[PDB]
Design a protein around this ligand. Structure first.
Ligand SMILES: [N-]=[N+]=[N-][C]1O[C][C](O[C]2O[C][C]([O])[C]([O])[C]2[O])[C]([O])[C]1[O]
Length: 427
């Protein structure tokens, strides 16, 4: 299987997951995409401390189970998130400290893991344990104040509670190998493995943006941790701007590491993202697949002019015009600039540098032309493996009008038919 993310990842023994919000399980558009595309689920908030133990000793798995059941019922495994960390703690726990806190932490772990014993693939036992101050040390938290050994204690407690779950340490900004935070975690995990502390995986949240950008050395980081004898997982991936290239690079980084279990993107549609402003996911609010989706799928499936297969002619802007609204056509292939198209990370097909292949509408017969680039979804395109080029907004295929093949044949949008007049090759 290779038309969906999860199925494609499965080809190499991995998974492709997302974060599920219980409040959206009633949204048909949401669940249609989620159930179809992913085979691993993480509760976005339903399994956190405050949600699972609102009152000390008073556990509530209502929201957590709703997500877990939806996942398993729809063929997805589940990553437990999260058992012990400083954020989103319930009121009662926030007012705790010292030995009473340590005991509360242990009790919480036993209660939650006990409830899901044997049903969880991976548990983010501890997360956000390190600081961003650049020192490479632990962050000052109620948990940390109970003693530096709290992390180790949490893992040992977890192993005993559910020996079948892979136990991960999860954090952010630990992707770039040169960062001090990354080294602090690396040193901790190494020490743990040397002393026999039960840790099976390290989760890299992968929340990339211009503030903490993706760097190719992320693969090295994954490989270095893998070499320590633990599995690695990309747990909450989202990329500011959703560059097709960056999304493909991250996907390939996991595929290049034997120990990388899989990749989870933090949400389904940009509208469901905790950072919608950064439009960091693989699907748009209207549910359309972004160019990034195609890039990720292509990667999971095993990794200039635009020539029409059926006509043998190239996508051409009539008389090298630069006028907005000029409908494109088929023409004998040559080296002029009016036949050179660049596919950008934003999914555009540019010509002349600042002009974009543009759909003047959404229905069949819609004119395909050039127009000033501005970021519209009607200027976004998906270059599919079968040679088809689909408009993001319309969901229709680039089509040579009436199957025409002669110079001057115009280009339009039309329901995809896999016809020769809808297949294109770049050469
Ligand atoms: N970086 N880091 N980390 C992360 O972040 C994000 C989160 O999630 C969130 O939380 C909050 C709420 O509100 C929302 O919805 C969600 O999404 C996670 O958990 C972490 O880890």
């Amino acid at each position: 299987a290779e038309s969906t993310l999860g199925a494609a990842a499965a080809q190499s023994g991995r998974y492709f997951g997302t974060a599920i919000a219980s409040g959206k399980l009633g949204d048909s558009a949401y669940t249609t995409i989620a159930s179809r595309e992913f085979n691993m689920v993480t509760a976005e908030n339903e399994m956190k401390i405050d949600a699972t133990e609102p009152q000390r000793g008073q556990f509530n798995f209502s929201a957590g189970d709703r997500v877990y059941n939806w996942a398993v019922q729809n063929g997805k495994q589940v990553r437990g998130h999260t058992l012990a960390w400083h954020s989103q703690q319930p009121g009662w726990m926030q007012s705790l400290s010292g030995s009473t806190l340590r005991q509360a932490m242990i009790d919480h772990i036993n209660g939650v893991m006990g409830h899901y014993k044997g049903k969880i693939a991976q548990w983010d036992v501890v997360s956000h344990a390190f600081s961003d101050d650049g020192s490479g040390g632990r962050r000052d938290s109620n948990l940390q104040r109970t003693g530096n050994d709290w992390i180790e204690v949490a893992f040992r407690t977890a192993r005993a509670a559910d020996p079948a779950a892979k136990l991960c340490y999860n954090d952010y900004n630990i992707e770039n190998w040169t960062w001090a935070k990354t080294q602090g975690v690396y040193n901790m995990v190494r020490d743990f493995k040397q002393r026999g502390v039960p840790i099976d995986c390290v989760g890299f949240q992968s929340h990339f943006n211009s503030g903490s950008p993706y760097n190719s050395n992320f693969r090295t980081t994954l490989q270095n941790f893998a070499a320590l004898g633990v599995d690695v997982a990309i747990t909450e991936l989202d990329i500011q701007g959703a560059s097709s290239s960056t999304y493909a690079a991250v996907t390939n980084d996991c595929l290049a590491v034997s120990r990388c279990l899989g990749i989870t993107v933090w949400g389904v549609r940009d509208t469901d993202s905790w950072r919608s402003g950064d439009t960091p996911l693989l699907f748009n609010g209207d549910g359309s697949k972004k160019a990034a989706y195609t890039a990720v799928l292509n990667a999971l499936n095993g990794g200039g002019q635009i020539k029409g297969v059926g006509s043998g002619r190239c996508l051409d802007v009539p008389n090298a015009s630069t006028t907005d609204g000029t409908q494109v056509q088929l023409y004998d292939c040559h080296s002029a600039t009016n036949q050179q198209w660049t596919y950008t990370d934003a999914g555009e097909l540019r010509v002349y540098g600042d002009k974009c292949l543009d759909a003047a509408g959404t229905g069949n017969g819609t004119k395909v032309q050039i127009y000033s680039c501005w970021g519209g979804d009607n200027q976004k395109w998906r270059l599919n493996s079968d040679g088809s080029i689909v408009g993001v907004q319309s969901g229709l295929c680039l089509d040579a009008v009436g199957g025409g093949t002669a110079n001057g044949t115009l280009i339009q949008l039309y329901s995809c038919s896999n016809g020769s007049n809808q297949r294109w090759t770049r050469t």
